[PDB]
Paper text:
Diphtheria toxin (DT) is secreted by Corynebacterium and causes disease in humans by inhibiting protein synthesis. DT consists of three domains—receptor (R-), translocation (T-), and catalytic (C-)—and similar to many other A-B toxins it enters the cell via the endosomal pathway. After the binding of the R-domain to the EGFR-like receptor on the cell surface, the toxin is endocytosed into the cell, and acidification inside the endosome promotes the requisite conformational change and membrane insertion of the T-domain followed by the translocation of the C-domain into the cytosol. Following translocation, the C-domain is proteolyzed from the R and T domains and proceeds to inhibit the EF2 translation factor, leading to the termination of protein synthesis and cell death.
DT was crystallized under varying buffer conditions in an effort to determine if conformational changes, particularly in the T-domain, are observed with a decreasing pH. Since the crystallization conditions were identical except for the buffer, the crystals of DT-5.0, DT-5.5, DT-6.0, and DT-7.0 have similar unit cell dimensions and diffraction resolutions. Overall, all of the structures are very similar, with RMSD deviations between the Cα atoms of 0.34 Å (997 residues, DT-5.5), 0.38 Å (999 residues, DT-6.0), and 0.41 Å (1000 residues, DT-7.0). One region that stands out is the TH2-TH3 region of the T-domain, which consistently displays large B-factors in each subunit of all structures. Interestingly, the residues between H223 to P234, which span TH2, appear to become more flexible at a lower pH. Analysis of the B-factors for each structure shows ordered TH2 residues in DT-7.0 and slightly higher B-factors in this region for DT-6.0 in each subunit (TH2-A and TH2-B). As such, these structures suggest that the structural stability of TH2 is pH-dependent. The set of the structures generated for mildly acidic pH values of 6, 5.5, and 5 retain essentially the same conformations, with the hotspots of partial unfolding highlighted by the elevated B-factors. We demonstrate that neither catalytic nor receptor-binding domains change their structure upon this acidification, while the T-domain undergoes a conformational change that results in the unfolding of TH2–3 helices.
Numbering used by the authors:
A (entry chain A): 4 to 39, 48 to 187, 200 to 352, 354 to 516, 522 to 536
B (entry chain B): 5 to 38, 48 to 187, 200 to 351, 354 to 516, 522 to 537
The structure:
């Protein structure tokens, strides 16, 4: 019951990876030893890029140096025992172990290695590494881990790069879409741009026109938006001017709101220390405006445009420190650039990692105040290759006032996929509402509720979509245009569009 | 597939059937039919049955018929099913995969194997998500045995609109919006008339271009009208209760009235069902209804009448500026909006989990957070050992931070397992540094920056350790929620996931 046989195997020269903190990259290669409770043991993973994320200075985890990644290998045969649950008690009861001795102590006995090892010399436990990941984590008994041989995958400190660039440049190989930026180039171009802009003519003439004394947030954002406009005319920011001109997330006013907000929270104690600056910056809103990240996309994905945005942000913080600050320099050009760069790398890394987009599987689709999601993963799958019925639950609510649900657009395929008009319905806080379904064309049925549906704070709906298949012939991608069910919200003549994405699969 | 805990035998088994206008008296002569689920449908909940009683040709606005109670004499087996897929049911319960399920249900061999001696079988299924009622599926021929008596005839109450049905449905709650819609209709007609002759308002209709204009100007005139109309003393209470919350501001009544006049043409204003279908798809109705932040604020007949009267006048004023017709404002507009009021009020009277409870999302400041599963939202007690709990987190557009999480602790009983507690961002696992704030609250910060946004989500895994098999008593626990902290504005955006303490089962 608790062992997943599909994830269990025996293997010769079983290898795994271990992230190593600075100062241990070379010592750990002399053998795994325990330092001077069911889960006490040596930890590793099958994904060396996830290993790399355990490698940062423990005293300065936000900003410190990354150590390395090493590869550990068991001689001979090793049993990888994948467990379906991470509760040790549940595991010891259901495997007939002694519920007293720790779980990882027993994993290392000869008696356990016989009952579960399949002839191998040792057992390693395997568990899901994390939600949203396909990696595994391996738990090794410490005594058994003395057999491991340890060699080097990478030493980030040996690369001799600034900040955490080496670690994140390594992690970006995972997707070698992919944001793979040369952060040496970006730093150098950033330094050059701040210098060449502080020594401009109208920028000089716009720093001349500055209150240069603690005024209210209002005059500050006004002057800062002015500065922004003036600074954006320089030819070293001309591409930035172009990619930030339409999307309102990238407007002067958000740069100004960013720079004001930075100056409010950065005092001298903080500005004096990189780790403290990064923590402070890392809890601010609006970092999307300077990163160029909006609508599910990293728009600023070239070294040149990123350097421009960071330089422009560097200037505006410099200008915002006297107007709404207790601080008295400099920070804008050094620790603020270091720190923001680190936050860039963090978010870029997130966007490079495989992830389900809004409205896919059980990820919510957030739009116009609505929140909609497939109730479970299986609901988002339209199974094919049988005659008969399926049902699919979509959750719907909204953030505050009552917003309508006008209906739902559903996919159909002549002969293979039909809306079951009798089982399809929508339920609002348990009130069950029937639907009037009408084909738009041969591929789309529109279903509208027979009484008004509203959702809002405290009011939710479950839309239950029922499909009927009149043939057992499978569906091929030729036949389906849409890959989404369109839930329609309020009308503005257009309807707000809430999309739930499905995949067609066999059993 | 049979849930034996919901299955029983009963003498004089009774249930309710919603009945559409025209058949209230006809149906009491006996249940007669006019594929796997062909059959007669009833429910254990007579207020849910009432929702089936509306004219099938004007389901939005039509007249409501009634509810009857049907009773089987002798013994009835209620067979509750764990699935509503007939194929799966016919396979697991060894039946002809050929014959319809509800035909087999009414055969003597079915009644032998499953009836427990009872004369006939009724199938029971969950009525709906978010509901605790059941639907009963009766074999048609077996249903001929039913005696049928009248629970209520909404048409006999002689009331306007769907008032009688919704007034019936409000009994389920005896917190309960139970409004007298007769009174609200009377007070509403009275105020529209009594505002139409006012001095300043008559003179604020004087200054109306009474000719098509730009929407941007239309809203300026109507916000003007709104301010002037709100000084009338028949609206004095409305002025007080709408003065602070920006959902209830004049600009929002103006947007409502403008959007109304845009979609009502002559064909539409002359037919109540078509008015209601058109009004029902507009945004902003919460401004008129006084509904915001999870609460029905306008919950008195007087204040609802005031709000509906004012909206009516403003619609009246917005049709010449932005519209195409005559009268609508005081006739079909009022009837239709009243029905939309009753729909939403009924939703708020029904039992429902609030945001952040069970798997209902908590939507705040652009974030969306929820418990992954119902069981995650329960902290079990009465044992020594561990539990884990998953919270989903994302945000609507740009990257927003997650600063940390506030967790409950109990000196000696409930502690944060700092090794297993972590947060994972698109699969990147991030350890946490946890530090007690007092004896009752721990604060865990992620050791790398966490951001969520469109396409970037997080799973917060909270693990709890109990060093005592003694149960937690409501006393020991101050909060009923886990506090996830977002961005700093000096305060953090507060995202609340509410839990319940329960013993093992």
């Amino acid at each position: 019951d608790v062992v997943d046989s599909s994830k269990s195997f025996v293997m010769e020269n079983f290898s795994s990876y271990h992230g190593t903190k600075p100062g241990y990259v070379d010592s750990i290669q002399k053998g795994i030893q325990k330092p001077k409770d069911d889960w006490e043991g040596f930890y590793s993973t099958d994904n060396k890029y996830d290993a790399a994320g355990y490698s940062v200075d423990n005293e300065n985890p936000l900003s410190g140096k990354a150590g390395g990644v090493v590869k550990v290998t068991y001689p001979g045969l090793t049993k990888v025992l994948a467990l379906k649950v991470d509760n040790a008690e549940t595991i010891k009861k259901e495997l007939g172990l002694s519920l007293t001795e720790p779980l990882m102590e027993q994993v290392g006995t000869e008696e356990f290695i016989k009952r579960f090892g399949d002839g191998a010399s040792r057992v390693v436990l395997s568990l899901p590494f994390a939600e949203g990941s396909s990696s595994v984590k391996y738990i090794n008994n410490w005594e058994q881990a003395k057999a491991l041989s340890v060699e080097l995958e990478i030493n980030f400190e040996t690369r001799g790069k600034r900040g955490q660039d080496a670690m994140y440049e390594y992690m970006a190989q995972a997707c070698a879409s992919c944001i793979n930026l040369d952060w040496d180039v970006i730093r150098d171009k950033t330094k050059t741009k701040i210098e060449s802009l502080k020594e401009h003519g109208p920028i000089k003439n716009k720093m001349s026109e500055s209150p240069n004394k603690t005024v209210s947030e209002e005059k500050a954002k006004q002057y800062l938006e002015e500065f922004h406009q003036t600074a954006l005319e320089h030819p070293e920011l001309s591409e930035l001017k172009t990619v930030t001109g339409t999307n309102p997330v990238f407007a002067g006013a958000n740069y100004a709101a960013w720079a004001v907000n930075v100056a409010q929270v950065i005092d001298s104690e903080t500005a004096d220390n990189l780790e403290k600056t990064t923590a402070a910056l890392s809890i601010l809103p609006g970092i999307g405006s300077v990163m160029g990240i909006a609508d599910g996309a990293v728009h600023h994905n070239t070294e040149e445009i990123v350097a421009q945005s960071i330089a422009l942000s560097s200037l505006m913080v410099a200008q915002a420190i006297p107007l709404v600050g207790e601080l008295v320099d400099g920070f804008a050009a050094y620790n603020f650039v270091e720190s923001i760069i680190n936050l860039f790398q963090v978010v870029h890394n997130s966007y490079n990692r495989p992830a389900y987009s809004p409205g896919h599987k059980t990820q919510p689709f957030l739009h116009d105040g609505y929140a909609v999601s497939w109730n479970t993963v299986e609901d988002s799958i339209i199974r094919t290759g049988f005659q008969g019925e399926s049902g699919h639950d979509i959750k719907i609510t909204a953030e505050n006032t009552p917003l309508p649900i006008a209906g739902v657009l559903l996919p159909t395929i002549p002969g293979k996929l039909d809306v079951n008009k009798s089982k399809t319905h929508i339920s609002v806080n348990g009130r069950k509402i029937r639907m009037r379904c009408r084909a738009i064309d041969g591929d789309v049925t529109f279903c509208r509720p027979k009484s008004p549906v509203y959702v809002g704070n405290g009011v939710h709906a479950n839309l239950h979509v029922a499909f009927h298949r009149s043939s057992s012939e499978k569906i091929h991608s030729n036949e389906i245009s849409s890959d989404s069910i369109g839930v329609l919200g309020y009308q503005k003549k257009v309807n707000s569009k809430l999309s739930l994405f499905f995949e067609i699969k066999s059993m």
